[PDB]
Ligand binder design. Structure first.
Ligand SMILES: [Ca+2]
Ligand SMILES: [Hg+2]
Ligand SMILES: [Hg+2]
Ligand SMILES: [Hg+2]
Ligand SMILES: [Hg+2]
Ligand SMILES: [Hg+2]
Ligand SMILES: [Hg+2]
Ligand SMILES: [Zn+2]
Ligand SMILES: [Zn+2]
Lengths: 172, 172, 172, 172, 172, 172
């Protein structure tokens, strides 16, 4: 048993390692989307950038979660990073919609993780999430949603001019 | 025989002069395209500005090639510079496609020139091409590729508005 | 077929996607080592840092490889990121030795990739590697080796004072 | 007909296209002399440097001419750019003598062009020439004239020291 | 066997050591030429200064090569540095012609070394020569070639004035 | 004879030429040592660092000696530079001792040189020796002496930790 461990439950420890992988996954998904728009037949540099940043952000959440693990005394155990669902994300609107779902999912995962920490009376963990992931996911979803909304209302996905202008004005 | 000549094959010497003309040619095409967009009936400054820059760029590659010839003891032999294939390039999309094919042929020419250098066992020549040219072409083509894609997805050439916004946003 | 593709062979394309995963893998391995030293029972912040940077560097190679893919016209296809071998890396010396092998491996993979590009006459690819990965791997190995050497000669792994001082003076 | 054309005669438009070609030609010539001195057996950097600047100048002149065509409503028509009269320019004194002749020829047709505009009662065309070429050309001739005179009086071509010191003192 | 060794053939290893001597040799030659012009009966400070730089340059090339030897895992084996051919270099033109011959021989050696690395499928060793040596040599040669041309043309070595003036203007 | 020669004996001259070689030799010795510690199985940068500097220090001493020869009308006569009597230096301690001896010999050599100068009544040569060498060598030896002392009292060569710490705390 780690000398620093205190009030950190086994389920929580596992829950985290699990959350860690989901984050690494999310990062991989975003990495996949980024380079989809980098393709000469898609060509939307800002979508590409937007997503790559989104990618780097998730890998950062992953690492911060790993830090938490070591801080509490729990041991980290890595699992394969599943490959993303698709390989082709169609249009900018599809990618956004996809991302909106992914976030809503990761958020679902976090809320479950919070309930777990509440049933285990781990105030420190509940807080670490409330401040570092909860309000973050809420802002991410709301943004994604807005993009989805504007893209639909601009004529996308059928309209190629719409995504172009979106890549410029909103993501640029 | 030049006092500095060393391991520089005569076939190689001819290949470069050949390339020095292809480069000068491309420069001429790009110039033609430039001032095409400068017409009061075309009026797309940024396209014109763009192609003028490429015309100036190719012209330099032609010069770097000539410096190379001299460095290695070879002797430069210039030829006429054939007039560009067309006089009117129709639309910005059409011009971009025209350009994409051009840069593709020059790369083609370089890739051949490279095999020739290899066959003649001239590493310095192989290297000079790899660094100063090969990479550039690969990038140029990828950029022209992207431009062609965007203009398309926007509705060009039919949509006069697509070529306008592209000129402003992408090339401006 | 991608409009930008030219002289880019199918085997090469595959070879890359494969090299991409190996890089992502390497990054994961290094990520695993970093947080091993972050553990309160290992406690070597600089080893942790050293490795995390090494981790970020590899993920960067991965992305740059993905860029190449899109530049040449080849399509990217992601594969699961296998999980690292161990979970516990024992000592700083073990981690270094491990890393030395990993690099030597990734380098082996790159050299094979180079021979492939040579058999396919893709000067652009041979070069992209010669300049962005070859000389890089050689410097990485030589460094790792030096650390391994100093750690052995300082009394590690049996000596706990040796690794401590190494974390300070060399990695700090 | 161009929506902007006004008082621009067909003979003039043709004469301009003709003048454009001559300028691009002179440019080639200079480019030629430029890399002549860049040869290891001629080795006169400044002569090289000088003529290169001249080459760029004549090209800048061609572009201005084209810009004019578009402005007045005419239509540019490019023709092949014949190769320089020679490949080897012998000595500095010879090239200076060669240029002097070239600029005078160019100046010649320019005057012809001005005479034409005068007959076609096109005040604008005469004024454009009056300021952007007739003045440059007179100075150009006077300069080369001065150069030739100096080289002759110093010893060229009998003296190799003459060209060397003229390279450093006048052109450097 | 060095833990860092990989795809580094024993022939290459031995070739490198041999080349290391050749470089140190040139350094000694250039050092001999440097002080030759420092003699009161020769008195050409820039010639002296010029060659001293080449001597220092070559030693640097030597050192780099030794670092390569160590980075690849090979082992350095020094040999005697055979003194230069003469003690008197007659004239500046004589010295410049010799140095041209030397760089040309050192370049020839480098070419043989590059073929060996290729024949031994060692991309890293091939590329290392491509950048840090092969390109420098073609340049060194072309410069020497030029210095030799001017000195000739200025009337050397019969004319003492020529070298004095070359010393001040080119090398000064 | 040299117009500048004046009270510079024959034996003195030959002696300096002799000293010049010894200094060059010492330089080659340190060069050897330097790259020994640069080996991946020795890995002691600062030692590598330290000796490489001394190598240059000695080579400079050589050059100033050659400048002396020319300053006084003597003629320089370079000889082969024998390789070091060692390839592998075993340890930092052994190497430091080797250096110490080496320096004492060169000092011994300089002391004999100063003697010759006195028996030949040459105050300039004597003074030259005093201010530019005799004084450096003493300090040098004293420094090398101190280094040996520290390494020995630190537990060298059996303690790898000692040399490692000396490398960081004294040579760093
Ligand atoms: Ca005294
Ligand atoms: Hg809680
Ligand atoms: Hg080659
Ligand atoms: Hg290749
Ligand atoms: Hg007029
Ligand atoms: Hg090779
Ligand atoms: Hg004395
Ligand atoms: Zn807009
Ligand atoms: Zn310490």
């Amino acid at each position: 048993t780690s000398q620093v461990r205190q009030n950190y439950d086994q389920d929580s420890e596992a829950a985290i390692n699990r959350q860690i992988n989901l984050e690494l996954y999310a990062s991989y998904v975003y990495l996949s989307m980024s380079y989809y728009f980098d393709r000469d037949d898609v060509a939307l540099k800002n979508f590409a950038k937007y997503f790559l940043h989104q990618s780097h952000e998730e890998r950062c959440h992953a690492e911060k979660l790993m830090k938490l693990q070591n801080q509490r005394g729990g041991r980290i155990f890595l699992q394969d990073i599943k490959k993303p669902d698709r390989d082709d994300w169609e249009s900018g609107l599809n990618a956004m919609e996809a991302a909106l779902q992914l976030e809503k999912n990761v958020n679902q995962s976090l809320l479950e993780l919070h309930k777990l920490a509440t049933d285990k009376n781990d105030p420190h963990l509940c807080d670490f999430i409330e401040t570092h992931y909860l309000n973050c996911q809420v802002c991410a979803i709301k943004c994604l949603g807005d993009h989805v909304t504007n893209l639909r209302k601009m004529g996308a996905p059928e309209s190629g001019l719409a995504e172009y202008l979106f890549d410029k004005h909103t993501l640029g």
